[PDB]
Swiss-Prot record, chains A, B:
Protein name, per record: Triosephosphate isomerase
Similarity field: Belongs to the triosephosphate isomerase family.
Gene Ontology MF: a single term: triose-phosphate isomerase activity
Ranges that cross the membrane: none
Enzyme class: isomerase
HAMAP family: TIM_B
Positions annotated to bind substrate: N8, W9, K10, G172, S212, G233, G234
Keyword tags: Cytoplasm, Gluconeogenesis, Glycolysis, Isomerase, Phosphoprotein
Length: 251, 251
């Protein structure tokens, strides 16, 4: 299971900043055969970034996309559009959208199917809230989100999906889940996959941990058996740090 | 009041199709001082569109945007990013955003305040549902949406805002409101602006009609005293159709 590490810039840079970032990083990202390095930038910069990452191993991804090819959804961007640009990854179901922009597990599932239909590798986010963690439904929440999202896929496709387990209370809070704790939920997710798709799908899929990961702690997480890389937001905004993170995938 | 005509492509093209459209229309769109010709495109294409449209009376606008400059708002595009790119107009509160992605009058307000503080001209959308229509709250529903969306602005800036009345039921249904009716509602909205910001701003503010405006029915709408133009959706995808519309503004 090849490690994958994705940077979610969120709403954070200006085109110039964005291109300077790719320029700085693209030459020192680990080889593609070793670690999948992905920078999820805001829509406006995807175009220039896809080019700046000319023939580099630095992959470019979007922070969303709609579930339709084209249509009357003012503001949205389609999986067709993103593909045409050279974007290869797309974050789906991020809580920031689930709780703010009405992203239901239904829309997320639609989007995952669309992703595969259009050639994009989806990074499906799933995680519980503080309240759910405290109430004990962590495993249940995570399980439903994963069950629903992967609905409609074949095992061969599931092997290609990426699942980012991100406990909400850990996103940009400075409070990370522990490797051991995260490892279990991830093991649980992998176990849910196995029960729905099979031991091959489950043994292939790469599950990520997201939530206050830092270049000083990626190693700890990546070292765990069920975890295959980290979805990083805040610590991916600086080229250096990002290079630190992506190198954690044992170069 | 200089007529303004904006086209909302919604989720509709590929970068390539997008650039040729601009490449085809830009040099033939009406002279700025006569008609404000605008093309609202997907976030993905703006960089290039802005670049290719530089120097022409053809203005480029975004289909939506967030209210915060920076932020952990995965998938969102901020006013800073837009202005920084050269984008001049932005659509806010489109029914499609409203009923499908949790766009409320509060957030729409925050966004309107954001456009002004960030140097973007907002095309504030408002309109009644079929139900509210039948119940007779067209003037009410519409008045509230405008009062809420404009709250915070000074008369001086209200004079710069573009308000687009679109009876939800006419948006791409093929059925459009009668000029007389649309004019009545636009008038009423203007009364709202007059009452809130004084007659001066009310007379300078431009109010569009949206809801199945075809290149063959736009003149009818523009003719109406209270209607200063149209926000066209489907009829704005073809260079040929777009140029017809914008020309109806010329004279």
């Amino acid at each position: 299971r090849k490690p994958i590490i994705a940077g979610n810039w969120k709403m954070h840079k200006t085109l110039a900043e964005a291109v300077q970032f790719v320029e700085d990083v693209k030459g020192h990202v680990p080889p593609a055969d070793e670690v999948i390095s992905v920078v999820c930038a805001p829509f406006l910069f995807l175009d220039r970034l896809v080019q700046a990452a000319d023939g580099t191993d630095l992959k470019i991804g979007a922070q969303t996309m709609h579930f339709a090819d084209q249509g009357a959804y003012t503001g949205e961007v389609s999986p067709v559009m993103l593909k045409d640009l050279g974007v290869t990854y797309v974050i789906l179901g991020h809580s920031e959208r689930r709780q703010m922009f009405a992203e239901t597990d239904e829309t997320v599932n639609k989007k995952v199917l669309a992703a595969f239909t259009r050639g994009l590798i989806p990074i499906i986010c799933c995680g519980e809230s503080l309240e759910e963690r405290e109430a004990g439904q962590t495993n249940a929440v995570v399980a439903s989100q994963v069950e629903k999202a992967l609905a409609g896929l074949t095992p061969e496709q599931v092997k290609q999906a990426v699942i980012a387990y991100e406990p909400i209370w850990a996103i940009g809070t400075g409070k990370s889940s522990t490797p051991e704790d995260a490892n279990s939920v991830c093991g649980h997710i992998r176990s849910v996959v196995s029960r729905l798709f099979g031991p091959e799908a489950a043994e292939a899929i790469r599950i990520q941990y997201g939530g206050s990961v830092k270049p000083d702690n990626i190693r700890d997480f990546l070292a765990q058996q069920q975890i295959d890389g980290p979805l990083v937001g805040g610590a991916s905004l600086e080229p250096a740090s990002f290079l630190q993170l992506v190198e954690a995938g044992r170069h």
